[PDB]
Amino acid sequence: RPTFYRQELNKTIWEVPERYQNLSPVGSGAYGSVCAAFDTKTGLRVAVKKLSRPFQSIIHAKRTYRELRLLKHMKHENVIGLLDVFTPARSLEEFNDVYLVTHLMGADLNNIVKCQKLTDDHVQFLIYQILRGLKYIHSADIIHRDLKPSNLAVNEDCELKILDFGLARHTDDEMTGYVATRWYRAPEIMLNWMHYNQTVDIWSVGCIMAELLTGRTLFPGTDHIDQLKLILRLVGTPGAELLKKISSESARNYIQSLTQMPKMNFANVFIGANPLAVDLLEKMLVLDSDKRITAAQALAHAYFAQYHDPDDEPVADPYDQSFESRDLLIDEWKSLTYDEVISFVPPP
Template identity: 60%
Template sequence: MLGFLLLLLNKRRKCVGKPVGACPCADPTCQVETVRGQSAHSGLKSSSAMQSPVSDSPVRPGFHRVEVQKTTWVVPDRYTTLWAIGSGAYGTVCSAIDQKTKEKVAIKKLYRPFQSLIHAKRAYRELRLLRHIQHDNVICLLNVFTPDSTLEKFQTFYMVMPFVAQDLGHIIKRKRLSDRIITYLFYQLLRGLKYIHSAGIIHRDLKPGNLAVSENCELKILDFGLARQTESEMTGYVVTRWYRAPEIIFNWMHYSQTVDVWSAACILAEMITGSVVFPGHDSIDQLKKILHLTGTPDTSLVQKMQSKDAQSFVKGLPPQKKRNFKEVFPAMSEKAVSLLEGMLLLDPEKRLTAKQGLAHPFLAEYHDPDSEPDSEPYDDSFESLELDVGEWKSLIHMEIMTFDPDNPGQTAV
């Protein structure tokens, strides 16, 4: 089985560093601020702690050991000046200086990636996705390594990605953005979504904290730990509640890329208004807040719901008509309201796609079909495989051993 999987691996490519464009705002006071100690990378909880050297058992040649926030990191000698910038449920992120390129990077260390079957498969999924991606508005993989010298000793690994100053969530909380910056950021978000959707990939966890923004207003989509391809059967509760599409709340088992479009629309509205659009206290309250704006589903949409419980619940709700979006969002331009209405449709089959959103008049200033590329085909046939933890570990180890940051297209297969 593992030998067969070797033939399915994609060729590696370097991350393209070209920016989409310069920040559209010439006024320095409108530029996005960078806050020391806050990072957009992976949408993790912010922290700040400098490294300290550690003396312990010998490490693999070419590596050195440091302690960051009482956690031991063993990294190649090329990465120095580690600084903890975030932590989350699945890993910790440090900034570092790559002495080879003289650039600042972000290094993600996964927490016990092989502690369970779920963790091992999630780690492999994220690694495969990051190796495939090559787009200005989506985070990519610069390097991946393990300090463990053999497969038998293999217990942890690190992924190196571009460092970006902070996430959109921090920015929204700190200041109100100009209309032009909002338009430019949202254009980049849809541009990135079009790319990953063209590969059949659904992000499934879009939120302001998973969108990195540089000082030049360049946006990158982060955190692909939950992403899957369209054809995969999916569990319902994966997106942070406030940005969750209604079909996920209705617990449809086969939803499409338009769940990301719904989340993107929530982010657009939040950038413009400065407030979360649907701040539900729980799933039921979330659904009620959505329906208060969109109105209750019609009969044809209710019949599409696979969950009988969801059908019964929605049928039991008092009928509500769709509200006037312009009255709900008086600060929005007519074009912004029009785009929002097309993206916040209850029926996912009628909702705008990312590609259609890019062509909307709201984004006319930046829309250029020739600079909005699709992805090369992405093979995620591994999703249907029934492997044990040891087999997933072997696949991850093989991915790491065949990755050459200087020649990412060269493989051992």
């Protein structure tokens, strides 16, 4: 057992192993708060997330367990992994806090797009890496669902990892109005049209890739409906096949009220872009999610010829998420989480 020390940081007491020094607050929300630190054991700059009252309700306890499971499984160069997980508790009886440790990220992709010269080469490399990461997570049936430039971290070498920095509770208020939390979302998620699949994240990749090519948000809607109109303007209104797959009858009935529009010419929206980038965008930004290119198919697209190596694009180990349908009490979620904390083995 390491020795732990205590310190107050803004609003709470952080109790962490001695290896972790120079803790400095970097973010806070209702689900957790994060400090940057130096891990003296590995020489790494690390982020330390202390979950906020992780076992306060069934919803919080299950979300704690879910995030811990996910981070324990994800072992890929383009996906955030878990460097450490700890608790000051010496037994299940006293277990109440959970701290998760990852590499400390620097710039995100907003910090890249808002103020650099992005060549086509940069765009190929950055999108290649997102798709490489997504082939991996999707091979485990892990769906991100909130892929957006602020969740992609990028180093000075343009190396990228997919994360989720979200520290707040999931919410309606959050996706309301002229907000980046909605601009990248697939329209079937945005309007709850149907059970969504892993290509919700490929739609987001199309939106991010468009934005690296033009420097502008592709669909900066002022609300859900305005955004839906921007979308349909570009990709055209749904045809009969897609309409049937809209299980929501009110939603299906709303889209039929709209004047039909044809899919636009993407070379005339993405003026000057590499024709192969334009081709790829046409395959990503398809309204019917059954017809969208997958991450694995996209990595094989000619746009990525300079980067694609089918022997160096790995898939994940099988990921059991049967717990998602398990009906458990707070203390059972808490014990499952405890076992995962104590069984953690650090990466090499």
